[PDB]
Amino acid sequence: XXXXXXXXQADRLTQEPESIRKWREEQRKRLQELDAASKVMEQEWREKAKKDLEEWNQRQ
């Protein structure tokens, strides 16, 4: 009666800091997009600048 009745983190490590692993590789799953963004956004919008550029030549 006392056991369960009386009742109603023993080794904080693989029991909590494993959360660094999910958290770890997701931060590197983070990376990308951002850097990918401008890199590609670069080679692009500029191709645009020539888009309009050639739009001024032919037309003239």
């Binding site: 999910k22 958290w23 997701e26 997009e33 990918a36 963004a37 645009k48 888009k51």
Partner: protein
């Protein structure tokens, strides 16, 4: 395990929900697989802190979409281009927003650098 409990004759809402907390900041890929299927039988506000807690924008956006929170779903294609954007996929959300501001800054992601097919963007609006 839930992989079975959800098919039982006695499946509820909590299942699909918690199931996502796993598909979330863990197994990406399939995570969408799930939602696209089980969107009705599930929570949504809590999930977003398991969603924004996993930047699965591709799926994280669809949530907002059906959630009808377009203002945010649309935003998910402002700092998350390659990830969830879908040419016209962005074209049918904006119209159901009450704030017209997003548009103008939007022209940017499209008009700013997005040429041909930014004007078609000018169409519906």
């Amino acid at each position: 395990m839930l992989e079975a409990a959800l098919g039982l004759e006695r499946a509820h809402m909590g299942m699909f929900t918690e199931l996502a907390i796993l598909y979330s900041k863990f197994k990406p890929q399939k995570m969408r697989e799930h939602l696209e299927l089980f969107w009705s039988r599930v929570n949504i506000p809590k999930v977003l802190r398991a969603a924004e807690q996993a930047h699965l924008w591709a799926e994280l956006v669809f949530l907002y979409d059906k959630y009808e929170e377009y203002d945010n779903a649309i935003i998910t294609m402002m700092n998350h281009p390659t990830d969830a954007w879908k040419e016209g996929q962005f074209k049918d959300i904006i119209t159901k927003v009450a704030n017209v501001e997003l548009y103008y800054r939007a022209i940017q992601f499209y008009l700013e650098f997005k040429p041909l097919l930014l004007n078609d963007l000018l169409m519906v609006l």
